[PDB]
Amino acid sequence: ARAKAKSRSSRAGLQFPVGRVHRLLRKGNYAERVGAGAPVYMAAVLEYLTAEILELAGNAARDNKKTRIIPRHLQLAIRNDEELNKLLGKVTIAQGGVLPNIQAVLLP
Amino acid sequence: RRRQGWLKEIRKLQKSTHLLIRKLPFSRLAREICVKFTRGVDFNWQAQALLALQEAAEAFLVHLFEDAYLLTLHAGRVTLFPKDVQLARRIRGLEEGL
Amino acid sequence: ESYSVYVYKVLKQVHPDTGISSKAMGIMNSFVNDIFERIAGEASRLAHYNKRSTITSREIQTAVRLLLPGELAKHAVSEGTKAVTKYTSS
Amino acid sequence: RKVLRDNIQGITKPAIRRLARRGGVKRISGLIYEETRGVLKVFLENVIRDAVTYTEHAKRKTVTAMDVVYALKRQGRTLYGFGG
């Protein structure tokens, strides 16, 4: 008596589950009432941010001739690009080596 | 002849508690910074808001100078240099220095 | 539950041939759960300061403009506004 | 009055000197003033923008004191005395 259940992530053109973040906003107790179009915005911005760090991680993994993203590559991707870095300034990546710096002291 | 008047100057100013930068030029500076992000429209300011912003700016600057002067004594000299202020901002953190 | 399937989907969309290690999948899996936490925690008290009880899309837009710095704001605020209209479109 | 001073130069040299004297500093170099007026500006550039966004989220046009103290509490510097 109904149509095929097109999920709401499909009708918005995204990959992140809008139903899941809708349930997380409701049960999270952030506010008493959650709007309709608000979790779609949340899923689109999470999709854009994860696509950004995965793109930088892939570019940082290609030049090391490795075809599999390990956490060292995510540290290089995060620390190299400053706009992301300020957002993640507080976080520490587990098993992430410090970006190579010699502090400009060497023999001529 | 009055030597080391900085000692009585500092002992006077640390005892005092009023705001130090003049009110009207600080209001013109904050209204200058305001107009660049409102894409042309002007905003008004409540009279308590500009006083609140001036209190916060004065407190942040006196913290920055008290952090920089420890580095100035750390380098063995007495006069504050801008490399010390840049280093104190480079070392305080990402949300503590800016 | 986790977010592991969607990180894999976005990775295959951006790079065709690359793969992601299990620990890096756990990194991204905690990262999503942190950024969503900070954005929704901002939008909660933004709704609370103005005596509103609903989180509308204006609140997520102003919370992402409060949190994401610089050009990462100006792209993502597009990506929401590009998305939500399409959601109303269908 | 006759001529207009630079708007950015709203903080005079004795004013910055008086700030550093309140900070317990003995001696000031001459090159501080071309840079501390920089480091004040970026501070306001961080705070004022956040306050405007708060005023932008409501329909209101004037920035109140509550929006500045909210813009400072979110950045980390709680200001007591006006909020409430």
Partner: peptide, 18 residues
Amino acid sequence: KSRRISRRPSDWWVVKSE
């Protein structure tokens, strides 16, 4: 695309003019 372009300014952090 016109995605954000990461420059490498002399300042480690964004103080002025990105």
